[PDB]
Design a binder for this molecule. Structure first.
Ligand SMILES: *[C@@H]1O[C@H](CO)[C@@H](O[C@@H]2O[C@H](CO)[C@@H](O)[C@H](O)[C@H]2NC(C)=O)[C@H](O)[C@H]1NC(C)=O
Ligand SMILES: *[C@@H]1O[C@H](CO)[C@@H](O[C@@H]2O[C@H](CO)[C@@H](O)[C@H](O)[C@H]2NC(C)=O)[C@H](O)[C@H]1NC(C)=O
Ligand SMILES: *[C@@H]1O[C@H](CO)[C@@H](O[C@@H]2O[C@H](CO)[C@@H](O)[C@H](O)[C@H]2NC(C)=O)[C@H](O)[C@H]1NC(C)=O
Ligand SMILES: *[C@@H]1O[C@H](CO)[C@@H](O[C@@H]2O[C@H](CO)[C@@H](O)[C@H](O)[C@H]2NC(C)=O)[C@H](O)[C@H]1NC(C)=O
Ligand code: 9K9
Ligand code: 9K9
Ligand code: NAG
Ligand code: NAG
Ligand code: NAG
Ligand code: NAG
Ligand code: NAG
Ligand code: NAG
Ligand code: NAG
Ligand code: NAG
Ligand code: NAG
Ligand code: NAG
Ligand code: NAG
Lengths: 777, 773
RNA sequence: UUG
RNA sequence: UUG
């Protein structure tokens, strides 16, 4: 097909509509900007390389650049790899950017720069210098940024990237940047709010600094400000996972009552970790539009019981009062002020880490009439007692979250969220059952025993999360009787005792059941387990039974008219299917609608004959990955007449079938990565017209000849993976080298990991760049 | 040193006292008996190879052989590898053994043999033909075994190795084997006890067969028999993990009341899985010496409550009545007959799988006066209730085992349910004193009074319960003598630094696999709880996912071993955060620290300085370590063992001696090392063990590996590298061929990878004369 | 690779 | 390899 092979070690994309030529050289172990970058290049990304300098020659030809992303070519020592530390800061020579008349966005984050780079074109809207070593801002260094709208300067002086002094900002440094919308000075050891800021700011980020006091006029002119973040100034340091220095005398960040008076447009106020003890209502006198308020990680335990300020927040969407508990105090109950009832717009309330013994219905009465309330998060509260029936008054909610408690008789937050330093930190790369309906999340509690009356009045629930409790009982179909509407039960990380084949049958509308990581009782010999419990679940679509160490079953067959997906990863089918024992060879046969089966990680070093014949007739998607498979009778695929995806990754296979078409007419996706294949059979893919995806990566293949890979098949492939093999680039490889260079077929990692290993001369050389003319003399 | 390199791909060992020359060729991927086997060879082992034939030429020179072990050179299809199936049964030519005048023991197990091999010498005392295809025994084929004392014939016809007929034994086939002591016909599809057996038998194994009936005279003459095993005839098949066919009519193995009358010497009787419903006392009328009786996997639930037969067993040491429960019956309690009191010699009583709701003190009264009772096993009984205090009447016992029950206020894990627990392959806190094992119960909450009257306990096993409480040092008050607590696989909440402090005599604490509360942010954990445990020697806190700690230091005057595998020291030691760099410093007598599997891709500076002063043994394995500042080992002045296995290191120190003068054992296996530094081992005289296996080393020169060091090494591991066998390698190849230093796998995995000619060739066999022209 |  |  192609007349001119692509040798450039970067992905090139065309977006004809937006007039964009996108060149992505992310993480290509470059020590130089590569030659041959298209002249029409608009967006060039060189992040995570080791290019030690920029010069007028760097971008000479590239006069149409709108965006240069040159991040993380010299990451500060403690932020970067300890195996490849950058020896000297990036050097930017004069005039490197002044010729780029159309340049809108420049990212120079993570390059150990000492100063704001000069000579930047007046087109620039966005400049980013995070994770550098710039800790003095002078008005004179900013005159070049007349048109700048977005300026990121954070992470230039903090514990991971120290500068060993206070940050310095000259008076009025930013004032004459008349179009500046977004200013970020986070994580920078700043001691005062810099003034005067231009009145065009929409977003101001001042968090994780050393600001002890806000002056009453610090935000006087910012009548367009929408987002203000002052978090992590006078931090609450208890159990902090980073070095944390509090303000002296347990002082809060001191905020005058009239500090916010000019912020009539403010939508987001973030006061996380400011050691606040009071929230004066006078703060919010002139902010009628505030939508999001974060007051997490303070000392507002008393204030939550008073909270006059809430009367001024009728448009608030999101309130977070998490982790406000008094140290070494365990309150008897949660005292929510009546003032919460005035939060007419509230969709999301989070109050983790209040820390109290007993939740009772009346304590939530202030919320009964919040019509728009969607999420109530009372996680990580060490609640010992809670009658779940109280949530009958909360049918309108999408999520009731009691995760991480001590109870016994629409996006999830990262596992580190309230305690991390900077949850918005940008990486060097880049720049759940809620969907089923009403969710009650009781995960990570101390529930040892359940009975029907625990769920009295909760028939509206679509999802119940019981993950990570202590449930050890012989469920018999009597325990969830009220849960008539339940579509999803997550029962993972309990100790299910499957003595009874009637377990879960009362959940007549159950579509998905997760009983993964319930291995306990499956580890002891002589215990009766009824894997045939599936028969009674008439609308079950998906069953997850992973990591259960299942090596025995009293019943011989699982049956279902409905089940489409079975995850059975991390069990011991090798023990059930011991060579000579026929009894379990039809375990899955009567799952008549099953399409997806995952039996990876079952220590299946071989498959006894009868396994494939025993498969249910409509199996589409089979994983046998990570089994230590040392042999495989390819012909047995003939029994799986609807097989579309076969995953055999991470095994010990040494051969492919002589003729894949003769094994399976239906197979579309063949994953063979991470095996021990050293050669392909002569006619491997001959007439395999249905094949669309083939992964032969991370094998030991030396040679590939034309006969194995006919062109009428290769042309149908959406992707062919060949990387990390042992290719021999001798004159015997002429066809393969030619074909790789010239094909239109998508083959990933040509630039990094489709490499000759030999002979001598060409060792470590990309096959895409290989010249074999000496073979044609 | 050596003048003649050892090229034979087998270990050769000398035992001068017994005049033995031991040649072990186990698992050497041989397809031929190797040449050059010493002429003086007495014991030759060729197990797990693919040698397709034996012939007169096989052992011609080896006239002094006493033992040939030639097992598993052609394993039956379903018993063997499916990746290397044996194509044709072993072929044994005539006269292969008749020249071996001194041959005492021949093992030919696992070779797909169809017949008993003939032409065996009259010296033979032991013949073994397990896992063959010999399923008809003819008197004529046994005449050659006049002097045989031990004959193994089992596993020749069973579900893993089927013969598709009944086993056949001709009448009196064994009678004229006048010195036969041990006969094993297990796992063979035998239908009747073969008769007449010789009266010299000490041991008869007939288990896992199809014997429905014992005739009254089957064992008439066996007045020397010590062990009889008839188990697995009319099996109890409930929840069996193998294909199991019961006797028709739910029948037991039928044993007439006088069948054992002649067995005056019997010490062991095994009647496991015989579907017995009754144990007639008349069985044991003439056996006063029986010591071991296994009656597990029967239907003797009612019989346990009666059990008149026990009155005839005053010398019994070991009784097993495990897995005798009636299907779908969950008894209220355990009914032990008063007859148990007559078992004056009993050391070990096992009654798992009785299956009952509540154990009460009175129910064990029949045992109160068994003076020698050492082990009481009531595991896998689904007991819901048991007052632990009842065991105050049992201080004399070594182990009280309530493992796998349902209580709430060592045998292989498969034992009672496996087919043949004595099958031959081709190739714990009891020690501390009184042990109460409550592992795998449903204990959610504990308090001091649960342990009332149990102050004598030395080991308590609470492993695999549901304990989720903030232990505060009040919960084990009575357990004043406890030396070992296994608290693994619970949900310890380490809120309180006073946890466990009441166990004033605790030497070992295991709180491994208590990760639960360590997985959620904002929870207070006090790792400094070690301070209060004044005699603690060993602390195991593996697989706890520990990534946060309210306290900054662990302290102990006593602790010698800390296992901290499978945690998140990488998070505690984030580059820039100094606060936890002395976590272990104040464990002043610590000698062994295991911080493998802590995702430590690098070690921040200060880690080594923060190590306690007497550290001898440090594991940093399986951390994905990509770099390592070897010079920092200077801080570990007492370091003897450094384990850096399974990492991504690419280099060794320029000079190991300049890093550590104390280091004896350096484990670097499974890294990415491609070359050694020029002077690597110069003057590191006290180095004794070096493992460089599974790396990418191409060349090793004498400067890196001076001989004044290498010769002192007890072991040097080099296998699975990328050795380039050019003329540059002359020294290394010479030294490897000639050294006395132990180097494992020379015969199998110390290989050239090039150039061309020598690719895949063993370094030990490499001829490099062309380099010396 | 006699489980 | 800014968490
Ligand atoms: C190419 O560069 C331009 C400008 O740097 C990018 O345009 C930005 O796109 C994002 C989309 O998330 C918008 O939010 C910004 O407001 C745009 N800025 C400008 C000045 O146009 C464009 O995204 C880049 N394209 C690629 C593929 O990287
Ligand atoms: C933030 O600035 C403070 C000073 O305002 C820095 O603290 C100084 O650090 C040097 C070296 O650590 C010391 O000699 C001085 O004693 C410190 N002064 C004070 C007042 O504490 C601090 O290092 C800066 N933080 C970072 C991470 O760079
Ligand atoms: C070498 O072969 C002899 C002969 O088979 C072995 O000696 C026997 O070892 C068994 C195993 O415990 C003893 O119980 C016998 O009493 C020994 N004597 C005889 C004559 O059988 C000897 O152990 C073998 N040595 C090795 C290391 O394999
Ligand atoms: C043990 O012997 C029995 C016969 O007593 C074998 O069973 C016969 O096997 C063939 C083939 O499976 C059948 O056609 C016969 O009907 C069987 N006879 C009976 C009486 O069942 C059995 O296969 C043998 N067991 C093993 C493991 O080899
Ligand atoms: N798994 C299980 N959990 C129990 O709680 C139980 N109680 C009695 N039993 C009996 O023990 C036998 C082995 O588990 C089971 O078989 P059963 O005779 O039907 O009755 C069962 C229990 N089994
Ligand atoms: N780990 C733990 N387990 C508990 O059961 C508990 N109850 C209250 N608390 C309090 O919650 C805080 C966060 O773990 C702890 O700090 P405290 O305020 O000293 O008291 C503790 C508990 N902590
Ligand atoms: C709740 O707390 C506030 C503290 O401001 C207190 O004034 C109020 O009376 C408390 N109410 C209850 C029900 O405890
Ligand atoms: C839980 O509250 C409900 C009413 O919502 C009531 O029916 C039930 O009895 C309560 N249960 C307990 C144990 O308090
Ligand atoms: C249930 O909770 C666990 C633990 O919090 C979480 O990992 C899991 O994703 C949740 N399950 C669903 C279905 O959302
Ligand atoms: C299930 O268990 C409950 C426990 O109270 C019992 O009422 C019910 O009868 C049991 N179900 C069956 C099928 O026995
Ligand atoms: C499951 O199998 C058992 C036999 O082991 C049978 O008695 C029980 O009724 C079966 N249950 C279903 C739903 O098939
Ligand atoms: C096959 O199943 C796996 C999970 O087992 C899934 O990730 C994958 O997308 C499926 N493939 C197709 C083609 O549906
Ligand atoms: C495989 O190959 C042979 C020859 O084309 C043919 O006879 C046989 O039917 C084929 N089987 C399948 C399932 O394609
Ligand atoms: C357990 O037995 C002891 C006597 O050994 C007694 O002191 C205690 O009260 C008993 N516990 C219960 C709950 O009956
Ligand atoms: C405690 O019981 C567990 C679970 O059976 C067992 O694995 C462990 O080895 C026992 N602990 C000790 C210290 O022997
Ligand atoms: C620990 O908790 C116990 C049991 O609830 C409590 O009564 C006691 O005061 C505490 N003990 C110690 C040693 O602090
Ligand atoms: C452990 O550390 C905490 C504070 O971090 C302290 O309150 C406690 O007393 C310490 N305990 C011991 C035993 O050192």
């Amino acid at each position: 097909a192609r007349w001119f092979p692509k040798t450039l070690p970067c992905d090139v994309t065309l977006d004809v509509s937006k007039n964009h030529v996108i060149v992505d050289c992310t993480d290509k172990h470059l020590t130089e900007i590569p030659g041959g970058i298209p002249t029409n290049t608009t967006n060039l990304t060189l992040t995570i390389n080791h290019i030690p300098d920029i010069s007028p020659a760097s971008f000479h030809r590239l006069v149409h650049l709108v965006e240069i992303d040159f991040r993380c070519n010299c990451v500060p020592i403690r932020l970067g790899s300890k195996s490849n530390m950058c020896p000297r800061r990036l050097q930017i020579k004069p005039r490197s950017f002044s010729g780029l008349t159309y340049l809108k966005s420049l990212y120079l984050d993570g390059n150990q720069l000492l100063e704001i780079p000069q000579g930047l074109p007046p087109s620039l809207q966005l400049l980013s210098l995070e994770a550098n070593n710039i800790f003095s801002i002078r008005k004179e260094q900013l005159t070049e940024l007349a048109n700048i709208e977005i300026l990121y300067l954070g992470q230039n002086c903090y514990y991971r990237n120290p500068c060993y002094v206070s940050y310095s900002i000259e008076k009025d440094a930013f004032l004459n940047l008349t179009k500046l919308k977004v200013l970020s000075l986070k994580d920078n050891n700043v001691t005062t709010v810099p003034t005067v800021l231009p009145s065009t700011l929409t977003e101001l980020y001042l968090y994780n600094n050393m600001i002890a006091e806000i002056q009453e006029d610090d935000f006087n002119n910012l009548n367009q400000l929408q987002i203000l973040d002052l978090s992590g100034n006078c931090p609450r340091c208890y159990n902090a996972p980073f070095p944390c220095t509090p303000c002296k005398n347990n002082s809060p960040l001191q905020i005058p009552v009239n500090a916010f008076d000019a912020l009539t447009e403010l939508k987001v106020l973030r006061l996380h970790s400011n050691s606040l003890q009071h929230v004066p209502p006078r703060w919010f006198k002139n902010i009628n539009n505030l939508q999001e308020l974060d007051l997490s990680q303070n000392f507002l335990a008393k204030e939550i019981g008073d909270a006059k300020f809430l009367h001024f927040l009728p448009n608030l969407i999101q309130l977070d009062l998490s982790f406000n508990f008094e140290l070494q105090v365990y309150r008897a109950s949660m005292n929510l002020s009546q003032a919460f009832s005035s939060l007419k717009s509230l969709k999301i309330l989070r109050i983790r880490g209040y820390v109290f013994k007993e939740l009772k219905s009346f304590q939530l009465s202030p919320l009964h009439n919040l019509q728009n309330l969607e999420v109530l998060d009372l996680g990580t509260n060490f609640i010992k007692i809670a009658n779940l029936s109280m949530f009958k008054q909360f049918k309108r909610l999408k999520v009731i979250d009691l995760s991480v408690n001590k109870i016994s008789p629409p996006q999830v937050l990262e596992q580190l969220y309230y305690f991390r330093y900077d949850k918005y930190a940008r990486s060097c790369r880049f720049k759940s059952c809620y969907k089923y309906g009403q969710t009650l999340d009781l995960s990570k509690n101390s529930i040892f025993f359940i009975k029907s009356s625990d769920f009295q009045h909760l028939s509206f629930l679509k999802c119940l999360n019981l993950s990570g409790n202590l449930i050890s009982q012989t469920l018999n179909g009597s325990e969830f009787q009220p849960l008539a509407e339940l579509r999803y039960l997550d029962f993972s990380n309990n100790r299910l005792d499957l003595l009874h084949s009637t377990a879960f049958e009362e959940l007549r509308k159950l579509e998905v059941l997760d009983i993964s990581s319930n291995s306990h009782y499956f580890q002891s010999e002589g215990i009766t387990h009824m894997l045939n419990f599936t028969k009674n679940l008439k609308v079950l679509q998906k069953l997850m039974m992973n990591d259960n160490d299942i090596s025995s079953s009293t019943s011989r067959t699982m049956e279902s008219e409905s089940l489409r997906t079975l995850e059975f990863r991390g069990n011991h089918l090798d023990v059930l299917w011991r060579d000579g024992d026929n009894r379990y060879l039809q375990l899955f046969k009567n799952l008549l609608k099953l399409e997806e089966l995952d039996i990876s990680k079952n220590s299946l070093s071989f498959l006894p004959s009868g396994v494939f014949d025993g498969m249910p007739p409509n199996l589409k998607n089979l994983s046998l990955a990570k089994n230590g498979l040392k042999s495989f009778i390819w012909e047995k695929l003939r029994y799986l007449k609807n097989l579309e995806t076969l995953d055999l990754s991470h095994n010990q296979l040494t051969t492919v079938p002589e003729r894949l078409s003769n094994c399976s007419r239906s197979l579309k996706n063949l994953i063979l990565k991470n095996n021990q294949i050293r050669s392909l059979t002569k006619y491997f893919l001959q007439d395999a017209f249905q094949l669309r995806y083939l992964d032969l990566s991370s094998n030991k293949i030396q040679m590939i000849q034309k006969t194995s890979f006919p062109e009428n098949v290769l042309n149908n492939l959406k992707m062919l993976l060949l990387h990390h093999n042992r290719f021999l680039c001798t004159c015997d490889a002429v066809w393969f080298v030619w074909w790789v260079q010239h094909t239109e077929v998508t083959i990933p990692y040509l630039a990094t990991d489709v490499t000759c290993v030999g002979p001598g001369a060409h060792k470590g050389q990309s096959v895409i760049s290989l010249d074999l003319y000496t073979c044609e003399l």
